[PDB]
């Protein structure tokens, strides 16, 4: 097979700035080479065909250049919408094969966790399990410490998180971490706490409640 | 115009599945059409393409004598018959629409993918709970609710808040694998303080291969 290494693998720049993603085949595919854009979840879009030619329907911002074994997309400028894993693709050779993707996030200004705690739903607790989750909306970067306290003893091994991928309009994230305890356990203690740490936070903050 | 896929689900490894594609808006005999999958945290990857006529089929070497891809014309309808599934074959299967019908791509048309879970894991519906906003003298202008997703398999589930009317703020997190082997997720959305004893807030949950559907209504207290 053609095979088609593209770098970097991921790629953090502000709004309004330029950015260039290479494609690199490993024998020519002359011009035989398209640039798609994936967005979380949606359908592939494709961009450019035959290295240099930019798709109908697509902004003037997105173009392509190269030949034979190297070739470049390039987004003038960037825009919050552009979060995606970018793809090249050549048609010179079967199979058909794909780069292994750039991977493009919109790094926007610091913004700070709003923060809010759940307790465990009454119909849940009959089931035997009970579930506390910690949420924090909205904030950039992505890196944040949640902490769980249980009677103000750190907990250990009993949580998940997950992240949203980044807005589209406004390139935040959302996180959420789910405490999952025994109803006895659960039963058995008084304060719940979420401690968040974060660039956006002077010092970190606490979200608590009181079982009852 | 539109690729509309069907055909998704839950497969038992060593079985068979079709999937179909479903053109709209345009004329299928035009058009070469192909099949292009995403595994799990991986990128894509070219399965089989069909041209104008159903001997016209190409196919990547791990599918040779397993998949095969062909078309109706008369139906608007592409296919592909898997065979002999196994778990490097779970995957979000999109059908592509080539820009003509000699060559097949650029693919100027993706359809919105359908994704084969290749396991032997038994089909579970979730269980929703509420995530229910504080009402208090206490709290802040801005209530945060949600519905609580727990143990289903296989993926995916779809969540959306008052049939669809209310989709500002949400937020639908990506499952988490439990240590259990079922899937849970939650899905969120902040509203006004104000809102929130005038206003119902219920959560749309679905998960297709249990044929669960399911509406939770999240009120304070």
Same mark, same amino acid.
């Given at each position: /097979?053609?095979?088609?290494?593209?770098?970097?693998?991921?790629?953090?720049?502000?709004?309004? /700035?330029? *950015?260039?993603?290479?494609?690199? *085949?490993?024998?020519?595919?002359?011009?035989?080479?398209?640039?798609?854009?994936?967005?979380?979840?949606?359908?592939?879009?494709?961009?450019? @065909? !035959?290295?240099?030619?930019?798709?109908?329907? &697509?902004?003037?911002?997105?173009?392509?250049?190269?030949?034979?074994? !190297?070739?470049?997309?390039?987004?003038?400028?960037?825009?919050?919408?552009?979060?995606?894993?970018? @793809?090249?693709?050549?048609?010179?050779?079967?199979?058909?094969?794909?780069?292994?993707?750039?991977?493009?996030? &919109?790094?926007?200004? $610091?913004?700070?966790?709003?923060?809010?705690?759940?307790?465990?739903?009454?119909?849940?607790?009959? %089931?035997?399990?009970?579930?506390?989750?910690?949420?924090?909306?909205?904030?950039?970067?992505? !890196?944040?410490? $949640?902490?769980?306290? $249980?009677?103000?003893?750190?907990?250990?091994?009993?949580?998940? /998180?997950?992240?949203? /991928?980044?807005? %589209?309009?406004?390139?935040?994230?959302?996180? %959420?971490?789910?405490?999952?305890?025994?109803?006895?356990?659960? !039963?058995?203690?008084?304060?719940?706490?979420?401690? $968040?740490?974060?660039?956006?936070? %002077?010092?970190?903050?606490?979200?608590?409640?009181?079982?009852? | 115009?539109?690729?509309? #896929?069907?055909?998704?689900?839950?497969?038992?490894?060593?079985?068979?599945?079709?999937? =179909?594609? #479903?053109?709209?808006?345009?004329?299928?005999?035009?058009?070469?059409?192909?099949?292009?999958?995403?595994?799990?945290?991986?990128?894509?990857?070219?399965?089989?393409?069909?041209?104008?006529?159903?001997?016209? +089929?190409?196919?990547?070497?791990?599918?040779?004598?397993?998949?095969?891809?062909?078309?109706?014309?008369?139906?608007?309808?592409?296919?592909?018959?898997?065979?002999?599934?196994?778990?490097?074959?779970?995957?979000?299967?999109?059908?592509?629409?080539?820009?003509?019908? =000699?060559?097949?791509?650029?693919?100027?048309?993706?359809?919105?993918?359908?994704?084969?879970?290749?396991?032997?894991?038994?089909?579970?519906?979730?269980?929703?709970?509420?995530?229910?906003?504080?009402?208090?003298?206490? =709290?802040?202008?801005?209530?945060?609710?949600?519905?609580?997703?727990?143990?289903?398999?296989? #993926?995916?589930?779809?969540?959306?808040?008052?049939?669809? +009317?209310?989709?500002?703020?949400?937020?639908?997190?990506?499952?988490?694998?439990?240590?259990?082997?079922?899937?849970?997720?939650?899905?969120?959305?902040?509203?006004?303080?104000?809102?929130?004893?005038?206003?119902?807030?219920?959560?749309?949950?679905?998960?297709?291969? =249990?044929?669960?559907?399911?509406?939770?209504?999240? #009120?304070?207290?």
């Amino acid at each position: /097979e053609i095979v088609l290494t593209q770098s970097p693998a991921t790629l953090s720049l502000s709004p309004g /700035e330029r *950015a260039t993603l290479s494609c690199r *085949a490993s024998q020519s595919v002359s011009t035989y080479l398209a640039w798609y854009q994936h967005q979380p979840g949606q359908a592939p879009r494709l961009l450019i @065909y !035959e290295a240099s030619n930019r798709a109908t329907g &697509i902004p003037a911002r997105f173009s392509g250049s190269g030949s034979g074994t !190297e070739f470049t997309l390039t987004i003038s400028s960037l825009e919050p919408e552009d979060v995606a894993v970018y @793809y090249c693709q050549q048609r010179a050779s079967w199979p058909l094969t794909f780069g292994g993707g750039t991977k493009v996030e &919109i790094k926007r200004t $610091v913004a700070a966790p709003s923060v809010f705690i759940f307790p465990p739903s009454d119909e849940q607790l009959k %089931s035997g399990t009970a579930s506390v989750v910690c949420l924090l909306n909205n904030f950039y970067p992505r !890196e944040a410490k $949640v902490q769980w306290k $249980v009677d103000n003893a750190l907990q250990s091994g009993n949580s998940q /998180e997950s992240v949203t /991928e980044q807005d %589209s309009k406004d390139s935040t994230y959302s996180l %959420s971490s789910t405490l999952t305890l025994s109803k006895a356990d659960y !039963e058995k203690h008084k304060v719940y706490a979420c401690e $968040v740490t974060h660039q956006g936070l %002077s010092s970190p903050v606490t979200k608590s409640f009181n079982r009852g | 115009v539109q690729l509309l #896929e069907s055909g998704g689900g839950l497969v038992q490894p060593g079985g068979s599945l079709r999937l =179909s594609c #479903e053109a709209s808006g345009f004329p299928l005999r035009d058009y070469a059409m192909s099949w292009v999958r995403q595994a799990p945290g991986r990128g894509l990857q070219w399965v089989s393409t069909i041209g104008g006529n159903d001997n016209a +089929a190409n196919y990547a070497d791990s599918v040779k004598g397993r998949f095969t891809v062909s078309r109706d014309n008369s139906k608007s309808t592409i296919y592909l018959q898997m065979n002999s599934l196994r778990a490097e074959d779970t995957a979000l299967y999109f059908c592509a629409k080539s820009v003509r019908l =000699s060559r097949p791509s650029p693919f100027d048309l993706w359809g919105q993918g359908s994704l084969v879970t290749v396991s032997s894991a038994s089909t579970k519906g979730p269980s929703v709970f509420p995530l229910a906003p504080s009402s208090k003298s206490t =709290s802040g202008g801005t209530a945060a609710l949600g519905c609580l997703v727990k143990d289903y398999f296989p #993926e995916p589930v779809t969540v959306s808040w008052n049939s669809g +009317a209310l989709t500002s703020g949400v937020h639908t997190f990506p499952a988490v694998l439990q240590s259990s082997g079922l899937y849970s997720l939650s899905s969120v959305v902040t509203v006004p303080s104000s809102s929130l004893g005038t206003q119902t807030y219920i959560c749309n949950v679905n998960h297709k291969p =249990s044929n669960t559907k399911v509406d939770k209504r999240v #009120e304070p207290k």
